[PDB]
Amino acid sequence: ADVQQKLAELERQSGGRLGVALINTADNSQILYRADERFAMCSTSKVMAAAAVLKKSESEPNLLNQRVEIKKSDLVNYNPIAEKHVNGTMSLAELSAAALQYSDNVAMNKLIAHVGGPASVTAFARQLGDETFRLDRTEPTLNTAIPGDPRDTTSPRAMAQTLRNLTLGKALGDSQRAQLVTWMKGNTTGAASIQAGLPASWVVGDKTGSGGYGTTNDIAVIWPKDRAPLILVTYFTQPQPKAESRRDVLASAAKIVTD
Numbered sequence: 586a587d588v589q590q591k592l593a594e595l596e597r598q599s600g601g602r603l604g605v606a607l608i609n610t611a612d613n614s615q616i617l618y619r620a621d622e623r624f625a626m627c628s629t630s631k632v633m634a635a636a637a638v639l640k641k642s643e644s645e646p647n648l649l650n651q652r653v654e655i656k657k658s659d660l661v662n663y664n665p666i667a668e669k670h671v672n673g674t675m676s677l678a679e680l681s682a683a684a685l686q687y688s689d690n691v692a693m694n695k696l697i698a699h700v701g702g703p704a705s706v707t708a709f710a711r712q713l714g715d716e717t718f719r720l721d722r723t724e725p726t727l728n729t730a731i732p733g734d735p736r737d738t739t740s741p742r743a744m745a746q747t748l749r750n751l752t753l754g755k756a757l758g759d760s761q762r763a764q765l766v767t768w769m770k771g772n773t774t775g776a777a778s779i780q781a782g783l784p785a786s787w788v789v790g791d792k793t794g795s796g797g798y799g800t801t802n803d804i805a806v807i808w809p810k811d812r813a814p815l816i817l818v819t820y821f822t823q824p825q826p827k828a829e830s831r832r833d834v835l836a837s838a839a840k841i842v843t844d
């Protein structure tokens with residue numbers, strides 16, 4: 586299923602293409618909708634870039650304190666934190682938090698560059714057992730979200746399983762995992778997306794993403810009250826290049842799958 590029917594109805598009403606994967610770690614059950622189709626990740630890919638740097642820091646413990654220059658030449662389209670630090674330096678920790686909590690695109694590019702570019706972030710995904718994730722481009726072009734274009738895409742199923750590994754599993758060391766979760770719980774951009782469809786008492790760590798074709802995404806680890814955690818990925822994209830974001834569709838998808 587009945588949840589399936591309701592998601593299909595939501596997708597039809599929304600006019601777009603909706604991809605949902607819920608992992609309920611209470612019973613290892615899944616709710617899936619278009620969960621093997623590819624969707625442009627847009628800013629949700631920043632979680633994988635931050636995780637790759639965190640993984641590197643397991644071998645180089647001072648890595649996160651390493652300072653990175655921010656130059657005018659680094660600015661791109663959306664740099665709310667980086668623009669405050671032009672001609673100075675930010676640590677890799679600060680850049681990670683900036684990418685995850687403000688969706689700063691300079692921060693993302695600096696994370697990508699540090700680990701060796703999009704192919705290296707992808708190789709990190711492969712090391713985790715995620716053969717679906719692909720990061721092809723840097724910011725800002727990885728957000729074009731052209732229909733049929735596989736660049737910078739993943740599936741809901743793969744992203745949900747990978748997010749589970751990163752936040753609830755053992756992909757990262759305890760310190761690094763805790764840091765990732767702390768950052769995602771501190772996200773400032775998600776209140777209108779998955780969170781808006783959940784009870785106020787639940788704790789969410791999430792990363793939103795938006796891009797071309799009205800692509801509106803959110804990936805979340807959810808701690809319900811007195812329940813085992815959930816992983817929820819909601820990806821949404823629309824047929825018109827200039828379509829507006831529909832965060833309400835993700836909130837509605839979240840409400841449907843957690844009732």
Ligand SMILES: [Cl-]
Binds near residue numbers: 825826827828
């Ligand atoms: Cl249009």
Ligand code: NA
Binds near residue numbers: 717
């Ligand atoms: Na993925």
